[PDB]
mmCIF file of C-alpha atoms in Angstrom:
data_model
loop_
_atom_site.group_PDB
_atom_site.id
_atom_site.type_symbol
_atom_site.label_atom_id
_atom_site.label_comp_id
_atom_site.label_asym_id
_atom_site.label_seq_id
_atom_site.Cartn_x
_atom_site.Cartn_y
_atom_site.Cartn_z
ATOM 1 C CA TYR W 12 0.000 0.000 0.000
ATOM 2 C CA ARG W 13 1.997 2.912 -1.371
ATOM 3 C CA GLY W 14 -0.756 5.517 -1.609
ATOM 4 C CA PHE W 15 -0.045 8.900 -0.009
ATOM 5 C CA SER W 16 -0.871 9.028 3.707
ATOM 6 C CA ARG W 17 -3.942 11.117 4.465
ATOM 7 C CA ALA W 18 -1.652 13.756 5.979
ATOM 8 C CA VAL W 19 0.249 14.165 2.709
ATOM 9 C CA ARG W 20 -3.041 14.066 0.806
ATOM 10 C CA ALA W 21 -4.440 16.833 3.013
ATOM 11 C CA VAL W 22 -1.441 19.078 2.418
ATOM 12 C CA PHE W 23 -1.629 18.946 -1.378
ATOM 13 C CA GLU W 24 -5.442 19.244 -1.449
ATOM 14 C CA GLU W 25 -4.809 22.817 -0.311
ATOM 15 C CA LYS W 26 -1.390 23.255 -1.921
ATOM 16 C CA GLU W 27 -2.329 26.837 -2.835
ATOM 17 C CA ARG W 28 -2.146 27.547 0.893
ATOM 18 C CA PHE W 29 1.589 26.770 0.685
ATOM 19 C CA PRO W 30 3.444 28.547 -2.173
ATOM 20 C CA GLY W 31 6.881 27.178 -1.246
ATOM 21 C CA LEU W 32 5.640 23.604 -1.623
ATOM 22 C CA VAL W 33 7.547 21.662 -4.275
ATOM 23 C CA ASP W 34 6.377 18.030 -4.322
ATOM 24 C CA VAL W 35 6.767 14.648 -2.626
ATOM 25 C CA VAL W 36 10.142 12.994 -3.102
ATOM 26 C CA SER W 37 8.749 10.120 -5.187
ATOM 27 C CA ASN W 38 7.467 12.580 -7.813
ATOM 28 C CA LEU W 39 10.829 14.364 -8.084
ATOM 29 C CA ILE W 40 13.146 11.407 -8.545
ATOM 30 C CA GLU W 41 14.257 10.309 -12.016
ATOM 31 C CA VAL W 42 15.996 6.925 -12.265
ATOM 32 C CA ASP W 43 16.476 4.127 -14.802
ATOM 33 C CA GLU W 44 14.180 1.132 -14.250
ATOM 34 C CA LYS W 45 17.337 -0.942 -13.792
ATOM 35 C CA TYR W 46 18.071 0.861 -10.517
ATOM 36 C CA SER W 47 14.457 1.296 -9.420
ATOM 37 C CA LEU W 48 14.466 -1.565 -6.907
ATOM 38 C CA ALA W 49 17.722 -0.473 -5.300
ATOM 39 C CA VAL W 50 16.784 3.212 -5.148
ATOM 40 C CA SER W 51 13.348 2.341 -3.778
ATOM 41 C CA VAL W 52 14.700 0.316 -0.862
ATOM 42 C CA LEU W 53 17.300 2.994 -0.107
ATOM 43 C CA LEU W 54 14.509 5.591 -0.017
ATOM 44 C CA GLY W 55 12.110 3.515 2.046
ATOM 45 C CA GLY W 56 9.458 5.733 3.596
ATOM 46 C CA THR W 57 11.257 8.975 2.735
ATOM 47 C CA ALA W 58 9.649 8.536 -0.696
ATOM 48 C CA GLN W 59 6.669 10.347 0.802
ATOM 49 C CA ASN W 60 8.634 13.214 2.356
ATOM 50 C CA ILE W 61 7.433 16.677 1.329
ATOM 51 C CA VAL W 62 10.037 18.884 -0.347
ATOM 52 C CA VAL W 63 9.537 22.613 0.283
ATOM 53 C CA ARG W 64 11.514 25.717 -0.678
ATOM 54 C CA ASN W 65 12.011 27.158 2.789
ATOM 55 C CA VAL W 66 11.519 26.692 6.520
ATOM 56 C CA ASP W 67 8.541 29.061 6.582
ATOM 57 C CA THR W 68 6.599 26.760 4.253
ATOM 58 C CA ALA W 69 7.579 23.850 6.497
ATOM 59 C CA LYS W 70 6.339 25.724 9.569
ATOM 60 C CA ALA W 71 3.099 26.610 7.804
ATOM 61 C CA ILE W 72 2.464 22.989 6.876
ATOM 62 C CA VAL W 73 3.105 21.750 10.421
ATOM 63 C CA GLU W 74 0.819 24.383 11.922
ATOM 64 C CA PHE W 75 -1.758 23.423 9.284
ATOM 65 C CA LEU W 76 -1.619 19.720 10.149
ATOM 66 C CA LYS W 77 -1.624 20.479 13.875
ATOM 67 C CA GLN W 78 -4.850 22.489 13.881
ATOM 68 C CA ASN W 79 -6.548 19.951 11.609
ATOM 69 C CA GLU W 80 -5.188 16.805 13.281
ATOM 70 C CA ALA W 81 -4.777 15.451 9.754
ATOM 71 C CA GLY W 82 -1.706 13.444 10.767
ATOM 72 C CA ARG W 83 2.083 13.834 10.572
ATOM 73 C CA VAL W 84 4.480 14.266 7.672
ATOM 74 C CA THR W 85 8.184 14.734 7.182
ATOM 75 C CA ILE W 86 9.250 17.865 5.329
ATOM 76 C CA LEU W 87 12.546 18.614 3.608
ATOM 77 C CA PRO W 88 13.221 22.367 3.421
ATOM 78 C CA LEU W 89 15.745 22.953 0.630
ATOM 79 C CA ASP W 90 17.312 25.735 2.700
ATOM 80 C CA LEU W 91 17.769 23.580 5.810
ATOM 81 C CA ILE W 92 18.674 20.043 4.751
ATOM 82 C CA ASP W 93 22.293 18.883 4.746
ATOM 83 C CA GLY W 94 23.124 17.126 1.482
ATOM 84 C CA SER W 95 26.815 16.693 2.255
ATOM 85 C CA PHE W 96 28.457 13.277 2.063
ATOM 86 C CA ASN W 97 31.875 11.710 1.638
ATOM 87 C CA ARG W 98 32.533 8.904 -0.819
ATOM 88 C CA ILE W 99 34.556 5.964 0.535
ATOM 89 C CA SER W 100 38.009 5.592 -1.035
ATOM 90 C CA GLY W 101 38.433 2.298 -2.891
ATOM 91 C CA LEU W 102 34.839 1.065 -3.082
ATOM 92 C CA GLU W 103 34.808 1.646 -6.833
ATOM 93 C CA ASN W 104 37.369 -1.171 -7.152
ATOM 94 C CA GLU W 105 35.000 -3.716 -5.584
ATOM 95 C CA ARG W 106 33.443 -6.551 -7.568
ATOM 96 C CA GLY W 107 29.781 -5.860 -8.246
ATOM 97 C CA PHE W 108 30.128 -2.131 -7.582
ATOM 98 C CA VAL W 109 27.413 -0.403 -9.594
ATOM 99 C CA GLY W 110 27.783 3.091 -8.186
ATOM 100 C CA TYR W 111 26.819 5.559 -5.502
ATOM 101 C CA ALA W 112 23.035 5.915 -5.429
ATOM 102 C CA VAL W 113 23.451 9.698 -5.668
ATOM 103 C CA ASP W 114 25.010 9.149 -9.114
ATOM 104 C CA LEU W 115 22.163 6.909 -10.259
ATOM 105 C CA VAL W 116 19.456 9.463 -9.597
ATOM 106 C CA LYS W 117 18.655 12.866 -11.090
ATOM 107 C CA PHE W 118 16.536 15.765 -9.827
ATOM 108 C CA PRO W 119 15.743 19.136 -11.416
ATOM 109 C CA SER W 120 18.937 21.265 -11.299
ATOM 110 C CA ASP W 121 17.670 23.491 -8.460
ATOM 111 C CA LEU W 122 17.168 20.443 -6.211
ATOM 112 C CA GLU W 123 20.576 18.746 -6.421
ATOM 113 C CA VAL W 124 20.915 18.921 -2.633
ATOM 114 C CA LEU W 125 18.152 16.287 -2.415
ATOM 115 C CA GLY W 126 20.323 13.531 -3.836
ATOM 116 C CA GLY W 127 22.987 14.106 -1.232
ATOM 117 C CA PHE W 128 20.389 14.371 1.526
ATOM 118 C CA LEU W 129 18.356 11.330 0.470
ATOM 119 C CA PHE W 130 21.189 8.964 -0.378
ATOM 120 C CA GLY W 131 24.374 10.268 1.218
ATOM 121 C CA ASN W 132 27.161 7.839 0.341
ATOM 122 C CA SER W 133 24.792 4.875 0.004
ATOM 123 C CA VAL W 134 26.067 2.321 -2.513
ATOM 124 C CA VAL W 135 24.420 0.072 -5.065
ATOM 125 C CA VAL W 136 25.975 -3.293 -5.949
ATOM 126 C CA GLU W 137 25.018 -6.194 -8.196
ATOM 127 C CA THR W 138 24.265 -8.833 -5.544
ATOM 128 C CA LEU W 139 23.905 -9.525 -1.822
ATOM 129 C CA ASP W 140 27.175 -11.463 -1.731
ATOM 130 C CA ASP W 141 28.886 -8.366 -3.101
ATOM 131 C CA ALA W 142 27.148 -6.309 -0.426
ATOM 132 C CA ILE W 143 28.167 -8.537 2.487
ATOM 133 C CA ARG W 144 31.729 -8.799 1.190
ATOM 134 C CA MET W 145 32.062 -5.027 0.736
ATOM 135 C CA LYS W 146 30.625 -4.196 4.167
ATOM 136 C CA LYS W 147 33.195 -6.522 5.722
ATOM 137 C CA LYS W 148 36.261 -5.470 3.723
ATOM 138 C CA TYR W 149 35.695 -1.791 4.486
ATOM 139 C CA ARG W 150 33.811 -2.219 7.780
ATOM 140 C CA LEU W 151 31.134 0.036 6.300
ATOM 141 C CA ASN W 152 28.372 1.542 8.436
ATOM 142 C CA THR W 153 27.019 2.930 5.171
ATOM 143 C CA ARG W 154 23.875 1.606 3.524
ATOM 144 C CA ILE W 155 24.298 -0.833 0.652
ATOM 145 C CA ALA W 156 21.513 -1.975 -1.645
ATOM 146 C CA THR W 157 21.479 -4.627 -4.353
ATOM 147 C CA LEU W 158 19.934 -4.415 -7.795
ATOM 148 C CA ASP W 159 17.386 -6.933 -6.446
ATOM 149 C CA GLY W 160 16.092 -4.561 -3.793
ATOM 150 C CA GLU W 161 17.826 -6.022 -0.755
ATOM 151 C CA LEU W 162 19.469 -3.689 1.730
ATOM 152 C CA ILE W 163 22.012 -3.896 4.536
ATOM 153 C CA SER W 164 23.498 -1.217 6.772
ATOM 154 C CA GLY W 165 25.728 -0.505 9.756
ATOM 155 C CA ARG W 166 22.863 -2.089 11.666
ATOM 156 C CA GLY W 167 21.784 -0.487 14.916
ATOM 157 C CA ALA W 168 22.135 -3.099 17.657
ATOM 158 C CA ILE W 169 21.581 -6.842 17.324
ATOM 159 C CA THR W 170 18.294 -7.750 15.646
ATOM 160 C CA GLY W 171 16.640 -11.005 14.670
ATOM 161 C CA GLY W 172 15.086 -14.055 16.265
ATOM 162 C CA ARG W 173 12.210 -14.976 13.954
ATOM 163 C CA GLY B 14 1.094 -4.416 25.087
ATOM 164 C CA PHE B 15 4.174 -5.516 23.131
ATOM 165 C CA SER B 16 4.919 -7.863 20.219
ATOM 166 C CA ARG B 17 4.456 -11.626 20.583
ATOM 167 C CA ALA B 18 8.234 -12.070 20.299
ATOM 168 C CA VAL B 19 9.035 -9.580 23.046
ATOM 169 C CA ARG B 20 6.307 -11.189 25.166
ATOM 170 C CA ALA B 21 7.713 -14.700 24.748
ATOM 171 C CA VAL B 22 11.143 -13.486 25.852
ATOM 172 C CA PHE B 23 9.817 -11.919 29.045
ATOM 173 C CA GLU B 24 7.417 -14.745 29.908
ATOM 174 C CA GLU B 25 10.542 -16.921 29.616
ATOM 175 C CA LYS B 26 12.778 -14.541 31.584
ATOM 176 C CA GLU B 27 14.136 -17.223 33.942
ATOM 177 C CA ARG B 28 16.097 -18.386 30.886
ATOM 178 C CA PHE B 29 17.963 -15.082 30.544
ATOM 179 C CA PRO B 30 19.491 -13.828 33.814
ATOM 180 C CA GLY B 31 21.200 -11.219 31.653
ATOM 181 C CA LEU B 32 17.815 -9.823 30.622
ATOM 182 C CA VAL B 33 16.979 -6.298 31.777
ATOM 183 C CA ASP B 34 13.750 -4.880 30.273
ATOM 184 C CA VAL B 35 12.297 -3.013 27.289
ATOM 185 C CA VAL B 36 13.661 0.519 26.823
ATOM 186 C CA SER B 37 10.205 2.040 27.300
ATOM 187 C CA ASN B 38 9.862 0.506 30.792
ATOM 188 C CA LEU B 39 13.220 1.940 31.877
ATOM 189 C CA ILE B 40 12.438 5.540 30.988
ATOM 190 C CA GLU B 41 11.645 7.848 33.882
ATOM 191 C CA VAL B 42 10.818 11.362 32.732
ATOM 192 C CA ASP B 43 8.670 14.357 33.679
ATOM 193 C CA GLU B 44 5.288 14.307 31.929
ATOM 194 C CA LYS B 45 6.086 17.680 30.358
ATOM 195 C CA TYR B 46 8.888 16.107 28.322
ATOM 196 C CA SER B 47 7.355 12.722 27.493
ATOM 197 C CA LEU B 48 6.195 13.757 24.022
ATOM 198 C CA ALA B 49 9.628 15.122 23.049
ATOM 199 C CA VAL B 50 11.379 12.076 24.482
ATOM 200 C CA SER B 51 9.014 9.746 22.631
ATOM 201 C CA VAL B 52 9.846 11.344 19.276
ATOM 202 C CA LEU B 53 13.575 11.246 20.006
ATOM 203 C CA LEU B 54 13.372 7.533 20.896
ATOM 204 C CA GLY B 55 11.444 6.594 17.777
ATOM 205 C CA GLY B 56 11.269 2.827 17.371
ATOM 206 C CA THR B 57 14.113 2.178 19.835
ATOM 207 C CA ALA B 58 11.495 2.481 22.577
ATOM 208 C CA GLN B 59 10.749 -1.229 22.133
ATOM 209 C CA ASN B 60 14.366 -2.401 22.006
ATOM 210 C CA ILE B 61 15.226 -5.074 24.562
ATOM 211 C CA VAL B 62 18.084 -4.200 26.885
ATOM 212 C CA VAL B 63 20.328 -7.068 28.036
ATOM 213 C CA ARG B 64 23.642 -6.940 29.896
ATOM 214 C CA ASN B 65 25.797 -8.777 27.365
ATOM 215 C CA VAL B 66 26.023 -10.182 23.852
ATOM 216 C CA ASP B 67 25.617 -13.723 25.203
ATOM 217 C CA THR B 68 22.134 -12.996 26.526
ATOM 218 C CA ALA B 69 21.496 -11.372 23.140
ATOM 219 C CA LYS B 70 22.525 -14.504 21.246
ATOM 220 C CA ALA B 71 20.557 -16.753 23.603
ATOM 221 C CA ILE B 72 17.390 -14.744 23.022
ATOM 222 C CA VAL B 73 17.945 -14.735 19.255
ATOM 223 C CA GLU B 74 18.458 -18.509 19.276
ATOM 224 C CA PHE B 75 15.444 -18.798 21.586
ATOM 225 C CA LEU B 76 13.293 -16.834 19.139
ATOM 226 C CA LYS B 77 14.769 -18.730 16.202
ATOM 227 C CA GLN B 78 13.319 -21.971 17.567
ATOM 228 C CA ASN B 79 9.860 -21.164 18.930
ATOM 229 C CA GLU B 80 9.490 -18.862 15.902
ATOM 230 C CA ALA B 81 7.698 -16.210 17.967
ATOM 231 C CA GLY B 82 9.070 -13.202 16.092
ATOM 232 C CA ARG B 83 11.947 -10.745 15.771
ATOM 233 C CA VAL B 84 13.345 -8.242 18.264
ATOM 234 C CA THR B 85 16.061 -5.613 18.525
ATOM 235 C CA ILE B 86 18.486 -6.076 21.421
ATOM 236 C CA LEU B 87 20.800 -3.549 23.079
ATOM 237 C CA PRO B 88 23.717 -5.214 24.909
ATOM 238 C CA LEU B 89 24.980 -2.877 27.632
ATOM 239 C CA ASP B 90 28.520 -4.143 27.016
ATOM 240 C CA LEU B 91 28.580 -3.128 23.353
ATOM 241 C CA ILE B 92 26.635 0.141 23.107
ATOM 242 C CA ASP B 93 28.539 3.437 23.015
ATOM 243 C CA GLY B 94 27.079 6.138 25.244
ATOM 244 C CA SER B 95 29.629 8.864 24.605
ATOM 245 C CA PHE B 96 28.504 12.300 23.444
ATOM 246 C CA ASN B 97 29.539 15.948 23.530
ATOM 247 C CA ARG B 98 27.633 18.985 24.742
ATOM 248 C CA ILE B 99 27.541 22.234 22.773
ATOM 249 C CA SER B 100 28.877 25.220 24.715
ATOM 250 C CA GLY B 101 26.386 28.066 24.989
ATOM 251 C CA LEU B 102 23.456 26.107 23.601
ATOM 252 C CA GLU B 103 21.955 25.743 27.079
ATOM 253 C CA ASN B 104 21.755 29.543 27.338
ATOM 254 C CA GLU B 105 19.600 29.872 24.211
ATOM 255 C CA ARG B 106 15.962 30.921 24.368
ATOM 256 C CA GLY B 107 13.609 27.988 24.005
ATOM 257 C CA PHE B 108 16.242 25.532 25.246
ATOM 258 C CA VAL B 109 14.651 23.042 27.631
ATOM 259 C CA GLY B 110 17.550 20.624 27.997
ATOM 260 C CA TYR B 111 19.639 17.813 26.554
ATOM 261 C CA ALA B 112 17.399 14.742 26.468
ATOM 262 C CA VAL B 113 20.111 12.763 28.256
ATOM 263 C CA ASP B 114 19.721 15.115 31.236
ATOM 264 C CA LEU B 115 15.921 15.045 31.229
ATOM 265 C CA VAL B 116 15.589 11.246 31.275
ATOM 266 C CA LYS B 117 16.462 9.091 34.292
ATOM 267 C CA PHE B 118 17.621 5.466 34.040
ATOM 268 C CA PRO B 119 18.559 3.249 36.976
ATOM 269 C CA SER B 120 22.148 3.738 38.218
ATOM 270 C CA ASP B 121 23.637 0.684 36.484
ATOM 271 C CA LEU B 122 22.141 1.704 33.124
ATOM 272 C CA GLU B 123 23.578 5.201 32.693
ATOM 273 C CA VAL B 124 25.261 4.278 29.399
ATOM 274 C CA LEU B 125 21.772 3.709 27.961
ATOM 275 C CA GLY B 126 20.972 7.414 28.098
ATOM 276 C CA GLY B 127 24.059 8.418 26.157
ATOM 277 C CA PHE B 128 23.429 5.750 23.522
ATOM 278 C CA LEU B 129 19.718 6.468 23.084
ATOM 279 C CA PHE B 130 19.860 10.276 23.036
ATOM 280 C CA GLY B 131 23.479 11.290 22.482
ATOM 281 C CA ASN B 132 23.505 15.097 22.539
ATOM 282 C CA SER B 133 19.945 15.423 21.200
ATOM 283 C CA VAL B 134 18.128 18.467 22.499
ATOM 284 C CA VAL B 135 14.624 19.412 23.585
ATOM 285 C CA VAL B 136 13.382 22.944 22.903
ATOM 286 C CA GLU B 137 10.053 24.681 23.407
ATOM 287 C CA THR B 138 8.930 25.314 19.831
ATOM 288 C CA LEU B 139 9.657 24.422 16.214
ATOM 289 C CA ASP B 140 10.674 28.064 15.761
ATOM 290 C CA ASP B 141 13.246 27.663 18.538
ATOM 291 C CA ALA B 142 14.426 24.384 17.002
ATOM 292 C CA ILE B 143 15.109 25.909 13.595
ATOM 293 C CA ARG B 144 16.859 29.007 14.981
ATOM 294 C CA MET B 145 19.203 27.076 17.258
ATOM 295 C CA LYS B 146 20.028 24.551 14.529
ATOM 296 C CA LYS B 147 21.136 27.328 12.174
ATOM 297 C CA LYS B 148 22.863 29.397 14.867
ATOM 298 C CA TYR B 149 24.993 26.453 16.019
ATOM 299 C CA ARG B 150 24.919 24.370 12.827
ATOM 300 C CA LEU B 151 23.671 21.479 14.934
ATOM 301 C CA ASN B 152 23.999 18.086 13.286
ATOM 302 C CA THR B 153 22.175 16.373 16.144
ATOM 303 C CA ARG B 154 18.436 15.760 16.459
ATOM 304 C CA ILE B 155 16.141 18.324 18.043
ATOM 305 C CA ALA B 156 12.699 17.672 19.523
ATOM 306 C CA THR B 157 10.093 20.233 20.602
ATOM 307 C CA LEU B 158 7.689 19.988 23.546
ATOM 308 C CA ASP B 159 4.847 19.673 20.998
ATOM 309 C CA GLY B 160 6.368 16.561 19.476
ATOM 310 C CA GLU B 161 8.058 17.900 16.358
ATOM 311 C CA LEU B 162 11.406 16.478 15.295
ATOM 312 C CA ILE B 163 14.256 17.995 13.321
ATOM 313 C CA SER B 164 16.644 15.268 12.165
ATOM 314 C CA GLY B 165 20.390 15.827 12.261
ATOM 315 C CA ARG B 166 20.311 16.504 8.517
ATOM 316 C CA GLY B 167 17.412 18.957 8.613
ATOM 317 C CA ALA B 168 14.281 16.845 8.040
ATOM 318 C CA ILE B 169 11.243 18.284 9.848
ATOM 319 C CA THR B 170 8.528 15.977 11.171
ATOM 320 C CA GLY B 171 5.396 17.518 12.631
ATOM 321 C CA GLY B 172 1.620 17.306 12.819
ATOM 322 C CA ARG B 173 -0.960 15.617 15.056
ATOM 323 C CA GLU B 174 -2.937 12.406 14.546
#
């Protein structure tokens, strides 16, 4: 169920009320179908984040949602988000290395900061084995996704059990 | 009130002497700050705290057999609770306090506070949150009394359900 939450729906229903509103992340991303599964898992729920021009628009949306109890949303003000990231020396030499997710996705020129913010130094590789191997060789805490849509990360704490 | 997996673990506590409790049951905080704390904790609120990796592995194995479900475990011996304060921040208008100072954990679980909140801060309003973040170029999370959250990288979460 990937439909927009009712909070997001509510915001755009009265988009006029917010001039600095740009769009939801999913509608701004441009990527080749080949990388769609990997990019999608890297994005996760941030696909529904609301991109706005400035903090005032963000504030206006929050106040709006608050007084209408229409739910919660996550907003990315272009003037506030940090899109900085550092590539990891040597990863490009790894077997199965496809590329940094930021290099596999395009946004309209004036929104380049989004790539950096959304993907940081996340990496895309051909297969899970490549992912596991890379994470070990470089003790990466960075997120790594496969062309199949699988994802691994620095992992916060020990999880599992099933 | 928790997941079947978490419930199995605790109803079988006698098997894990290294078992402590769920993060949410260990939090002691003034009602005024509960909303802010809740947003800062996010999903870690249901993490299971144990004293060592062994207890962690035992529980995982345990859950792997009875197939009750999955859980996230925080071994007190592995988690890093270090963090650094930001000089002058505490003198800013709207500053309520570092979350780590507002939340109380039992004496032998101090490290939990540092690991769960780091140098995250609680401020009065979203307006205060944005101003302080810019003024100090904060890269840590900020929560407001109303329950808004500004991620370390500038993402703003707000609204009411």
